[PDB]
């Protein structure tokens, strides 16, 4: 046993994986076995969801998060997002579960049987954390890999059946994307949009052309960057800017993943394009707007003039102006006027919600949709009692949007914490005081007093 | 002198796994009974006859909703002794009348007395100063003010907190709606002392852990300490400079630092105890008179204070009929305060 | 809602009041308002303060 | 606002009296021999 106790390794059991920092073979085992864990979960969870799945219920009434992901890719669904074939889900689940056996095999092998270090075994697979060129080379490999993934998404969208498009004319449906957005002004224009209300940065992407074109761009960017990094070594300014160690790179990746986590949280909370409400349930904004729509419809059926109806506050009971003048639903849902959804947009004119369209053009499918979303608002208790906190037991419901947003906020936050921990430790260790202050060389004792 | 008293003293003060002491004679039975009573009640005993509530695992409650609930309001401040005129020795009926509440509260109180006495006794035997017991005076001030003095100032034990998670939460929301207890500056000092104590705890732990001297080769630094070592394990000087440059001021005296760590949360809790003593008599900080006079004359005048009073009024009207079943409240739909739509 | 001392608040009641529900998550810096009077009516100080605070 | 008209003196003496006590003690401490 090499380095598998504290006396020899310097790391206690609870920091045990730090014993792996300089053992590239065992560390490879750790990584592959872990990827095994991830794929395993994807597969088993998919099979569980499918086994539990009732096709004539909406997915979001059934605690499903993975099947919605598969369905968004256009697999197993037709018009309106109705399930037409569960077999693609089965395939995805099974293939992941089987693949996990493979990753687990390689992982266990490398972790306990294979060579502890790879450097004497191979110069290509061996690495020194401090070897900047090897690091950028491996980074390059992984960038090419990711680029290939994004292009896999593009391939699915353009050549292998398309994607589920909630915005599809005449109603949501699977659609092949033939004209993806290549214009860099639009694509990176998303990247320069404000993250605040009515703009919402990349989370605002609202059509599949932009998504696919974006992934074309990202695929090419990632492959080009990978090649760049295989062919180059870090410039002087980068060399002088960073800490070059395993723990440092780890910290950088933790920071990045934290950022990505928060982005995913906002994505699943607000976006209804790559997270279709047919599969994930309505967004909070969607459901609030849907309530306003529902009662506007109800009361108008009863004879209300919803344009001229003055609420208790002086604001329109049903309809009012946004701060820039757009006609919007009134009451509290005033906050959500930036909401956009296929069921609401036909009522939208140049100046916002059109009163004549409201009076004359609201279709039964819109009433149905607004009622459905209003009554499947993403509110519910931890034990999955649906609705406001004061609602009685009856409905077993928590929106998938809530599960995914909450889970990913928690994960993103702890990963930010991990980022601070590991970046600070990498700094201290690189500078040589991660274990404490030298009693005979205490820096502050050589500093002048503050006063 | 070597009589039975001293021999008993000898045995009581033997160095064993669980120290006993003279204090143990009070502490252990009372603490055991308090805890056992809580577990027994939360597992098996109802609050149907006292509150119209289920409160046990037996009835289908979970850990969050189980409680040993206070007696009926009609019991007043009865000691509710098993052999008392209420239960008359009948254990089942005693349970049904809420006897386990006073059972737990009183054994709890004498148990806390026993524990603090234990702190004094052990401090004396080991030869340390008795600051742990002194600091423990704050938990006692809280228990006594909240579980004893408060209901004693109210109509009955009924309005004391019930021993349960959700029940305690109810106690919190009751205090907001009825006492506006957040507005009370003694509670505010309590908050400052608790959060301030947690701040001091966290900041001190982190400061020590991040100004450690390297006393070992290990990257895990805990082994590089020896209990009997003479030297400080961390650098006070470096810590002091760090906080001086970061925050503007810093501790320079460790004895002061730690006394301050005693002072802050203990004092906070004590202030809160004083406030609750006020609430026993409904002597609340509920209102600002100037605020009410202005708002009364000016219907456009609004502050977060007035908004909070609207919230309080809602709490009271909506919760009172079920929370206070002895009053036989019937609040017609039409009298219930509600805003638009909700 | 009045938050300030001079408009009838004391230390306990006083606040800087959150920006308007009409604004929502819209970014409302001083320069998006037609005037300081508007900025104040709609709770601009709240956004300025909390954003600078969180950054700081 | 219809405030308590004694609030001003109450607050002022509440601040001043112990503050003054402390200043007296500090200053007489400083002037003692080093």
């Amino acid at each position: 046993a090499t380095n598998r106790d504290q006396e020899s390794s310097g790391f206690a059991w609870w920091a045990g994986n730090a014993r792996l920092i300089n053992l590239s073979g065992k560390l490879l085992g750790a990584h592959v076995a872990h990827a095994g864990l991830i794929v395993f979960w994807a597969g088993a969870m998919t099979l569980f969801e499918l086994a539990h799945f009732i096709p004539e219920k909406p997915m979001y009434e059934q605690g499903l998060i993975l099947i919605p992901h598969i369905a968004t890719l256009g697999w197993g669904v037709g018009p309106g997002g109705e399930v037409v074939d569960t077999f693609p889900f089965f395939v995805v689940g099974v293939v992941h579960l089987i693949s996990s056996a493979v990753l687990g095999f390689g992982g266990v092998y490398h972790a306990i049987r294979g060579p502890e270090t790879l450097e004497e075994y191979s110069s290509f697979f061996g690495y020194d954390w401090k070897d900047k060129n090897k690091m950028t080379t491996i980074l390059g490999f992984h960038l090419i890999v990711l680029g290939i993934g994004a292009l896999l998404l593009v391939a699915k969208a353009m050549f292998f059946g398309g994607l589920y498009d909630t915005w599809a004319p005449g109603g949501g449906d699977v659609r092949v994307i033939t004209n993806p957005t290549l214009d860099p002004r639009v694509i990176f224009g998303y990247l320069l949009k404000s993250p605040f209300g009515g703009e919402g940065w990349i989370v605002s992407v609202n059509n599949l052309e932009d998504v696919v074109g974006g992934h074309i761009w990202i695929g090419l960017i990632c492959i080009a960057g990978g090649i760049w990094h295989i062919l180059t070594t870090p410039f002087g300014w980068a060399r002088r800017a960073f800490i070059w160690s395993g723990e440092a790179y780890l910290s950088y990746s933790l920071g990045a993943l934290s950022m990505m986590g928060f982005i995913a949280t906002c994505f699943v909370w607000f976006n209804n394009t790559v997270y279709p409400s047919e599969f994930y349930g309505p967004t909070g904004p969607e459901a609030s707007q849907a309530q306003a729509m529902t009662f506007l419809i109800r009361d108008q059926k009863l004879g209300a003039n919803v344009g001229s109806a003055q609420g208790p506050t002086g604001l329109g009971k049903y309809l009012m102006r946004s701060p820039t003048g757009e006609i919007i639903f009134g009451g509290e849902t005033m906050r959500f006027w930036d909401f956009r959804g296929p069921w609401l947009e036909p009522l939208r004119g140049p100046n916002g919600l059109d009163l004549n369209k409201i009076k004359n053009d609201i279709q039964p499918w819109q009433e149905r949709r607004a009622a459905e979303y209003m009554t499947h608002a993403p509110l519910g208790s931890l034990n999955s009692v649906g609705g406001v906190a004061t609602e009685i037991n009856s409905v077993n419901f928590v929106s998938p949007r809530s599960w995914l947003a909450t889970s990913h906020f928690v994960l993103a936050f702890f990963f930010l914490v991990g980022h601070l921990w590991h970046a600070g430790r990498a700094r201290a260790a690189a500078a040589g005081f991660e274990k404490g202050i030298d009693r005979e060389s205490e820096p502050v004792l050589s500093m002048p007093s503050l006063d | 002198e070597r009589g039975w008293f001293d021999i008993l003293d000898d045995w009581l003060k033997r160095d064993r796994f669980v120290f006993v002491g003279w204090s143990g004679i009070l502490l252990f039975p009372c603490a055991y009974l308090a805890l056992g009573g809580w577990l027994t009640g939360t597992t098996f005993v109802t609050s149907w006859y006292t509150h119209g509530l289920a409160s046990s695992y037996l009835e289908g409650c979970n850990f969050l909703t189980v409680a040993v609930s206070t007696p009926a309001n009609s019991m007043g401040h009865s000691l509710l002794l098993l052999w008392g005129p209420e239960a008359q020795g009948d254990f089942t009926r005693w349970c049904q009348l809420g006897g386990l509440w006073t059972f737990i509260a009183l054994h709890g109180a004498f148990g806390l007395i026993g524990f603090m006495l234990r702190q004094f006794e052990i401090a004396r035997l080991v030869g340390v100063r008795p600051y742990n017991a002194i600091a423990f005076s704050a938990p006692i001030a809280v228990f006594v003010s909240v579980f004893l003095i408060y209901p004693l100032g109210q109509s009955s034990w009924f309005f004391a907190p019930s021993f349960g998670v959700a029940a305690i939460f109810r106690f919190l929301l009751f205090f907001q709606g009825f006492h506006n207890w957040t507005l009370n500056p003694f509670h505010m000092m309590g908050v400052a002392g608790v959060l301030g104590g947690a701040l001091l705890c966290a900041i001190h732990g982190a400061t020590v852990e991040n100004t450690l001297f390297q006393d070992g080769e290990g990257a895990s630094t805990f082994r590089a300490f020896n209990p009997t070592q003479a030297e400080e394990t961390y650098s006070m000087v470096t810590a002091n400079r760090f906080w001086s440059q970061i925050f503007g001021i810093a501790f320079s005296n460790k004895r002061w630092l730690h006394f301050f760590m005693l002072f802050v949360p203990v004092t906070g809790l004590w202030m809160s105890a004083i406030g609750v003593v006020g609430l026993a008599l409904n002597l609340r900080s509920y209102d600002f008179i100037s605020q009410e006079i202005r708002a009364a004359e000016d219907p456009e005048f609004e502050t977060f204070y007035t908004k909070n009073l609207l919230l309080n009024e809602g709490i009271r009207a909506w919760m009172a009929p079920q929370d206070q079943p002895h009053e036989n409240f019937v609040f017609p739909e039409e009298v219930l305060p509600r805003g638009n739509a909700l | 809602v009045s938050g300030s001392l001079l408009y009838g608040n004391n230390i306990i009641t006083g606040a800087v009041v959150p920006s308007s529900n009409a604004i929502g998550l819209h970014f409302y810096p001083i320069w998006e308002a037609a005037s300081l009077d508007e900025w104040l009516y709609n709770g601009g100080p709240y956004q300025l303060i909390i954003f600078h605070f969180l950054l700081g | 606002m219809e405030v308590n008209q004694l609030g001003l003196i109450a607050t002022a003496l509440f601040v001043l009296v112990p503050s003054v006590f402390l200043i007296i003690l500090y200053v007489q401490t400083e002037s003692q021999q080093k």
């Binding site: 007093s449 | 810093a250 320079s252 100037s290 | 001392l5 004391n10 | 606002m1 601040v15």
Partner: peptide, 30 residues
Amino acid sequence: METITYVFIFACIIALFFFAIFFREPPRIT
């Protein structure tokens, strides 16, 4: 007069911060 009192006390506290920081008794190693 209330407002004057509140702002006054606050200002005294900030000034106190100033003295407590820049005019503290300096910590000295013996």
